Paper text:
Ung (family 1 of the UDG superfamily) is the most prevalent form of UDG and removes uracil bases, regardless of their state of base pairing or sequence context, via the cleavage of the glycosyl bond attaching them to the deoxyribose. Ung inhibitors (which are interchangeably referred to herein as UngIns) are DNA mimetic proteins utilising charge-based alignment with the Ung DNA binding cleft to dock Ung. Docking promotes the hydrophobic sequestration of the sidechain of the apical residue in the Ung DNA minor groove binding loop, which is essentially irreversible under biological conditions, to inhibit Ung. UngIn protein structures described to date fall into one of three observed folds: Ugi/SAUGI (note that Ugi and SAUGI share the same protein fold at ~12% sequence residue identity), p56, and Vpr; yet, within each fold, type there is pronounced sequence plasticity, to the extent that the unambiguous identification of an Ung inhibitor in any genome is rarely straightforward.
Of these, the most distantly related to structurally characterised p56 proteins is a sequence encoded by Bacillus phage VMY22 (“VMY22_4”; Gene ID: 26625151), with a sequence identity of 23% to Bacillus phage PZA p56. The VMY22 open reading frame sequence was synthetically optimised for E. coli and recombinantly expressed. The protein was biochemically validated to act as an UngIn and confirmed as a structural homolog of previously characterised p56 proteins. PZA p56 and VMY22 p56 variants show structural conservation (RMSD = 0.883 Å) despite low sequence identity (24%). The primary difference of note is a deeper inhibitory hydrophobic pocket in the VMY22 p56 variant, due to tryptophan in the 3rd β-strand functionally substituting a helix-located side chain that is a phenylanaline in PZA p56. In VMY22 p56, that phenylalanine is a cysteine and does not form part of the hydrophobic pocket. Other sequence changes do not contribute to significant observed structural differences. Furthermore, crystal structures were determined for each variant in complex with Ung and revealed fold conservation with PZA p56, SAUGI, and Ugi.
Residue numbers in the entry:
A (entry chain I): 1 to 225
B (entry chain M): 3 to 225
C (entry chain N), E (entry chain J): 4 to 56
D (entry chain O): 1 to 56
F (entry chain K): 6 to 56
The structure:
Amino acid sequence: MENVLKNDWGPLLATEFEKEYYRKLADFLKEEYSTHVVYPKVEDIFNALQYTSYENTKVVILGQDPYHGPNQAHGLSFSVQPGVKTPPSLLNMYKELRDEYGYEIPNNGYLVKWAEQGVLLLNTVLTVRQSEANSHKGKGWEHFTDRVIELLNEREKPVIFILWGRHAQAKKKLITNPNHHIIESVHPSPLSARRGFFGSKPYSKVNTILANMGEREIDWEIPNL
Amino acid sequence: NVLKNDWGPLLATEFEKEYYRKLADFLKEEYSTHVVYPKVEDIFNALQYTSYENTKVVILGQDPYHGPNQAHGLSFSVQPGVKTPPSLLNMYKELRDEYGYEIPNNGYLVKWAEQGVLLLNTVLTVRQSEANSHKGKGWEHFTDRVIELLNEREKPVIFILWGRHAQAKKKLITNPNHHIIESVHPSPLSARRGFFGSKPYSKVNTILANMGEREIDWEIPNL
Amino acid sequence: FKDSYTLIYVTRDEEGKMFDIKLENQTKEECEIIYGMITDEILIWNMILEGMF
Amino acid sequence: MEGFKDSYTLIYVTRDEEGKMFDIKLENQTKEECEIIYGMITDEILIWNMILEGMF
Amino acid sequence: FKDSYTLIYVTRDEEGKMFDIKLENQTKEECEIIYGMITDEILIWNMILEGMF
Amino acid sequence: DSYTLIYVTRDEEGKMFDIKLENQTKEECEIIYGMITDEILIWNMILEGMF
């Protein structure tokens, strides 16, 4: 929960780390990590920002909170560590990806390759108690992740925002600068994916925008391990 | 018809009716394919232990217990060695309340049947873990006939009818010399609405004393 | 009242073995009688009226 | 757990003779409390759901 | 819509270990996101609107 | 694997619907869920033969 950010995020978010709300969040999480199993590992909480700098951010994909099971979360939205089953939401993302480019369903849910190419995989809530989804909603995390979105909004170089589901889409109120690109659909969850996620072509829509800006396109293919 | 007592002749014509033959075919198939309770040789034990002549009280049940080593052809009774079902425990608690008898360490009620308590389920078989699996297969034509015959008996019969399904059989008890004892079912989901304090045991024995008949020793021994 | 219920329950015996049972077309009273037969630990007991509306 | 009394979440939905409907959710109920509540209901039961808290 | 649900679910992992989870005050969309996170076998999934009437 | 599906909805007029299905695949339950625009009061999927 200390500012361990090695890149341009460090200075940019410095004022957030000195606010009262953040100190009380940090004290709450210090107690929570002692008493309960919390995910991800404390050293992984900020990995989305660590892997994908303010400068290098091309697309933001908002999630909710981390996966709440053992060896799943590692500080990226949607990604799971190698060795565990792909969550249905990510499987549906892989199925839309097969549909777009013909890539087979990978044997893992590890998305560090996306983050390395400027996909900021940002959950709005960055911790969770084991087996209790949304256990850390309303503790301060969304003041922090709202600030991440506000900063990207203030950026001059256009930012692509992928907003899956109403909770992600509610963050449009922070994206007031009209130079930014917004890609919207229902969530890839099996309970919603058939109402517009399949056929939404988020991947090629992103790469079409990156080509029109003279920026290097993203290689979406996830390798087997 | 393996009935060794006066029930044998009295029910002989029931066993030859079409409904019974189709029930018997159904149960032959059911016992081959699935686990059915009780054991085929135990189906009629209530009639075997308690003759037409010796019947003093009928306690109607639904269908047999549907778990292993439970049912043995009596309503409410379980074989020695298994936990007492909550319905029977509530019956034991009302019994403690009446006479001070401690809760027995078993649910085996053969002692009641030997003293003229006909422990008659309305349905006499069940598939393992499927309550009411043999409802509407013919069994209640057969158990209705048992009740009709006891209704025609000259010597008064006491009927204990716990819950509405048992009480619906009042339509067969047209002879007004018979005694009807009624309350909600001893199930924990109904017992608090009038089963506790209903004193079914002493009500029976009060009637047996007024008829000059030997009273029932309700005490269940530990095994 | 229609008085016809789906009954869905989950029990656990002393060995820790578990049973999932679904019965249909049960009267309220039949559900109460079945409850009174159960000696195992009740994990779930769920009565749902068939044809509510 | 071993040494502690079991407790239940109780969710039920009833309907009176006028067709008016009630939804109740209770937590930390003993088995006996659920049985007492069941016995107090005269309205039509649409749903009765008892769930053991900490099954595993 | 009030869009606040009790979510009660039971899962089983590959080892046969079982999880009983009760969440309260979940939006419909939060329940959908949680469903999409689950890789274990779903035995029960029960969403109930809080304050139906 | 197959599921019993019990659900209760309410439309904008306040009219209410109860549906009970058996022998539904996981995918069939997900398709049915995705068709519902009315308010969900109950959605209950139960695996048939859990044990």
